[PDB]
Design a protein around this nucleic acid. Structure first.
Lengths: 75, 141, 50, 48, 123, 106, 80
RNA sequence: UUGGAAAAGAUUAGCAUGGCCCCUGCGCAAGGAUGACAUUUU
């Protein structure tokens, strides 16, 4: 039985889900057509995004590792 | 991690509202890890056995129980709705909408008086009671 | 102990006898005139003594 | 009486104060109009 | 019961005893308590002493037989302190009661008969 | 003298329930009191030309032993949507207020 | 004990008042008598009714003429 | 007399029953002192 079985009537879109940039969290997709060629395509595009983040990857990931380590050391 | 009871689907919520005949069903709609809901649940826990003669307090997760999101307009982090004998008791708080609380009050005596007002106006039969305070201004000086 | 459920009184429907003593304890025969009043026109005291 | 009832019993003189100074508080110069006429009554209430 | 509780009143005698102690409570002839029974034995105003065999320890009233032999006063043990306490008009257990002499009071015939009956019990 | 008071009486006792919800209770009151004292007659005063309920209702019980337990248990008990209030029936008709006026001057 | 006599008497009397008001609640009888020459002449007849009812409740339960005799006998004739 | 058109019950107060105590009367329980010279009623 739903919430209507109470005898009720009204008189994720929570603001915890909202964010002023990026909109609402959660993706619209993930359903509807994922297949062979969709998996190969996001392999190609994920390799492209990893390749674009290969520019500064050593220095960026080293800075992030050191900052989370000293942030967990201090607080 | 509260001592307040939790309802985990729509049947538990609607039968928890229908369970009480002489007590206000106080229902917090929100997530336990939210800071606003954490402060509101601290306030509801510190008065849960004070107002036990005329109220009952239930916590409801929005992710676990999402069917009341559209009807009750549960789009703020915490909402606190008040029911008495299956009737939704609205409260003219001054916030603009009367249906929910929708913020975390820090005074536990204000929550006691809001529950006591809902009880007095609901046993009298009103679907809308008037809060014994105006919450439009935050009264900070 | 919890708060009592805020029911109102059934009510005092019988009067005199015990009930006049019930109010003569605390809510007794007051002045009922010029102690509960403010006297609109006049100022009887010095003005802002309160 | 309850703490909320003591609160309301102390807001009673605010009620008689507001009703007393009503003709100069409930005018249109004071609260710019969102003139809501009172129900079954010819009073307009500038400002909630 | 306790073997040192001697003499011990049987059921008919303890019914008469508790009714006489109740009447003496009504006639204000009764002093409840082991200290008040000790006092009215020392003052010599006691008609007779009843005691409770179910007093633990018993010896907190077993000085009272010796006082009843040094004052020539009849003494007798009731079966339990709760019945004796209720027979004194108090809800608490009373382990030793002194029915006392009064100025020509109307219980003197009942008190004399019970005295003659409980001086037959120590045999 | 309304010709409708004569459907309950068998020298039986009537309880007066009032403060009842005018949107419902036409036979809800009978339903609630039915467990007590075997099939009985319980009316609700719904006035004519309107179809609106005037509030009060009369439940006629077979016993005044039954009556005391019923009254004590169902006082303020949630029935339809308003807690019922319970008192004893007046029935101050002609043959008793004539006796009352004759008892006034004595 | 005397406190228990007071409590037993008061609770027997509370159920007695409760069952008299119960018999009023059933409606068997109108309630009992609650308490210038004409009004206290009425109440004089009613207090005569009241004192007469006290003498009625003493008139029955009286040990008529021989119930005294059988109770004096059961006082004097022991269980030899 | 006839025809016709049309607060989910409040508040304040007085009397009485109730409580208590004294006394009287009645009762219940236990007392106290005393006075009197199996053949025939189917």
């Amino acid at each position: 039985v739903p919430g209507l079985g109470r005898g009720a009537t009204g008189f994720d879109l929570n603001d915890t889900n909202y964010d002023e940039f990026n909109g609402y969290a959660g993706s619209l997709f993930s359903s509807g057509p994922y297949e062979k060629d969709d998996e190969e395509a996001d392999a190609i595009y994920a390799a492209l995004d990893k390749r674009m983040d290969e520019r500064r990857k050593e220095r960026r990931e080293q800075r992030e590792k050191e900052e989370i380590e000293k942030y967990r050391m201090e607080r | 991690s509260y001592m307040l009871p939790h309802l985990h689907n729509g049947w538990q919520v609607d039968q928890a509202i229908l369970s009480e005949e002489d007590r206000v069903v106080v229902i917090r709609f929100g997530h336990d890890w939210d800071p606003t809901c954490m402060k509101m649940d601290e306030v509801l826990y510190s008065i849960a056995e004070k107002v036990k003669n005329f109220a009952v307090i239930y916590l409801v997760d929005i992710t676990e129980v999402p069917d009341f999101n559209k009807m009750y307009e549960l789009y703020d982090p915490c909402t606190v709705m008040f029911f008495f004998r299956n009737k939704h008791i609205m409260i003219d708080l001054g916030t603009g909408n009367n249906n929910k609380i929708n913020w975390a009050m820090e005074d536990k005596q204000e929550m006691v008086d809001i529950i006591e007002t809902v009880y007095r106006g609901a046993r009298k039969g009103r679907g809308l009671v008037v809060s014994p305070k105006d919450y439009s201004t935050k009264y900070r000086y | 102990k919890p708060l009592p459920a805020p029911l109102d009184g059934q009510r005092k429907k019988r009067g005199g006898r015990r009930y006049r003593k019930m109010k003569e304890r605390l809510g007794l025969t007051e002045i009922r005139k010029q102690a509960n009043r403010m006297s609109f026109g006049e100022i009887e005291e010095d003005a802002y003594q309160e | 009486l309850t703490n909320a009832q003591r609160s309301g019993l102390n807001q009673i003189p605010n009620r008689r104060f507001t009703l007393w100074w009503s003709p100069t508080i409930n005018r249109a110069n004071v609260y710019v109009g969102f003139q809501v006429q009172l129900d079954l009554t010819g009073i307009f209430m500038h400002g909630k | 019961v306790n073997p040192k509780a001697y003499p011990l009143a049987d059921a008919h005698l303890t019914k008469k005893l508790l009714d006489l102690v109740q009447q003496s409570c009504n006639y204000k002839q009764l002093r409840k308590g082991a200290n008040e029974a000790t006092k009215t034995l020392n003052r010599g105003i006691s008609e007779f002493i009843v005691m409770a065999a179910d007093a633990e320890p018993l010896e907190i009233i077993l000085h009272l037989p010796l006082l009843c032999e040094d004052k020539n006063v009849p003494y007798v043990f009731v079966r339990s302190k709760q019945a004796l306490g209720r027979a004194c008009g108090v809800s608490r257990p009373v382990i030793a009661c002194s029915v006392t002499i009064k100025e020509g009071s109307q219980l003197k015939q009942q008190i004399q008969s019970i005295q003659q009956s409980i001086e037959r019990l120590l045999v | 003298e309304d010709p409708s008071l004569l459907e309950w009486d068998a020298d039986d006792f009537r309880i007066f329930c009032g403060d009842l919800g005018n949107e419902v209770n036409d036979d809800i009151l009978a339903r609630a009191f039915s467990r007590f004292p075997s099939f009985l007659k319980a009316k609700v005063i719904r006035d004519k030309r309107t179809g609106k309920t005037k509030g009060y209702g009369f439940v006629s019980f077979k016993d005044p032993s039954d009556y005391v337990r019923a009254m004590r248990e169902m006082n303020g008990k949630y029935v339809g949507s308003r807690p019922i209030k319970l008192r004893k029936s007046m029935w101050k008709d002609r043959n008793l207020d004539v006796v009352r006026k004759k008892q006034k001057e004595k | 004990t005397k406190k228990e006599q007071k409590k037993l008497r008061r609770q027997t009397r509370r159920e007695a008042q409760k069952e008299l008001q119960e018999k009023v609640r059933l409606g068997l009888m109108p309630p009992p008598e609650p308490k210038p020459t004409k009004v206290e002449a009425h109440v004089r007849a009613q207090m005569a009714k009241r004192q007469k009812a006290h003498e009625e409740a003493n008139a029955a339960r009286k040990l008529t003429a021989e119930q005294r005799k059988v109770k004096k006998i059961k006082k004097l004739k022991e269980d030899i």
